Design a protein around this nucleic acid. Structure first.
Ligand code: MG
Ligand code: MG
Ligand code: MG
Length: 112
RNA sequence: GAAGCUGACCAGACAGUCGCCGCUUCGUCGUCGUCCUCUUCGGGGGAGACGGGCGGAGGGGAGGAAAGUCCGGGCUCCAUAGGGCAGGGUGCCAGGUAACGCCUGGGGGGGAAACCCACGACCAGUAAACUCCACCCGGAGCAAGGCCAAAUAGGGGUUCAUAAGGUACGGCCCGUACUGAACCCGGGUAGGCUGCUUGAGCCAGUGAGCGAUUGCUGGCCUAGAUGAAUGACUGUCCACGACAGAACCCGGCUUAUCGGUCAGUUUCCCU
């Protein structure tokens, strides 16, 4: 089962503060990814995009949707970690294929 | 036939593998210390409500601007001697609306798309050049509050309540009872459910009004999420796809929009 239930998202900011105080760098000159270990056995991810970086509410939402579709497909492969995503400045200019390959280009060096 | 305007619709459809939400129902497991009857009452059976009570089934899920600080209202909480000053808005006539800086029909001028413009007394006093002449004008907001869970005083003062609080006017003073308040000796809901999508709606028939709009009769009810809900490759009538995001709701205008199909309208004149 490749479902994406409620127990796979960082709801409260406490998990965000935990990931911030225990971070490991894994970013590009465009997108930065952080994370930390947990204990539930299944990995969880957080979604944080800055409104000041890019406006246009169809954007940011598109980034969230693409990130969810890229994360929920590899939940049975990558180890159990508490991830978090952030979007920098010039990110809304890329299309879907470029963003997808850029997101899949980072998770290869996550051998933790 | 080419070019320019206004109005109407659209700015994708179909299938293509897994998934996110909420609506209804189906049985299923606990709680009822809910109800009723039998009972071994260690309780069982049935009816309701709640809980992740586990899956199945059915049918669903972003606009012509959802976007703005540009207006008006719906619905709550707080507050409010009646007397003015001060400030703001509106200012051709007549209608629409629940209201309006919104809509419509006339007149004057402006004039040609200035067929759109302040068009309230330039003499009542030297006016998209000033005073004034009338009407109106509390504040904050679905994190408003409402219901619960839960909360766990701090013996109260120089003692007066007058200038602790301009009490509310509140920008100002006339004062209406002008108002219960200093630091120790302070510790306290962080959660849940409703508001919440039936809309001062939509469609059809039929009168009224030059117009905006409306009288009457029938039918329709699958965004409401809470780091906050839209991805997959093949063909296509692929108009080769652009501006863009719901967050309590409604009525207008204000920006942004590649463009495609019709209707009306003018110039070009092979026609
Ligand atoms: Mg919006
Ligand atoms: Mg409050
Ligand atoms: Mg809306």
């Amino acid at each position: 089962k490749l479902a994406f239930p409620r127990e796979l998202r960082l709801l409260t900011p406490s998990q965000f503060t935990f990931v911030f105080q225990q971070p490991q760098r894994a970013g590009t000159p465009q997108i930065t990814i952080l994370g930390r270990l947990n204990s539930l056995g299944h990995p969880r991810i957080g979604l944080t995009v800055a409104k000041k970086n890019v406006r246009r509410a169809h954007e940011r939402n598109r980034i969230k949707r693409l990130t969810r579709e890229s994360f929920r497909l590899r939940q049975h492969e990558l180890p159990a970690m508490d991830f978090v995503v952030v979007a920098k400045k010039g990110v809304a200019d890329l299309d879907n294929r470029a963003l997808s390959e850029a997101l899949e280009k980072l998770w290869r060096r996550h051998c933790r």
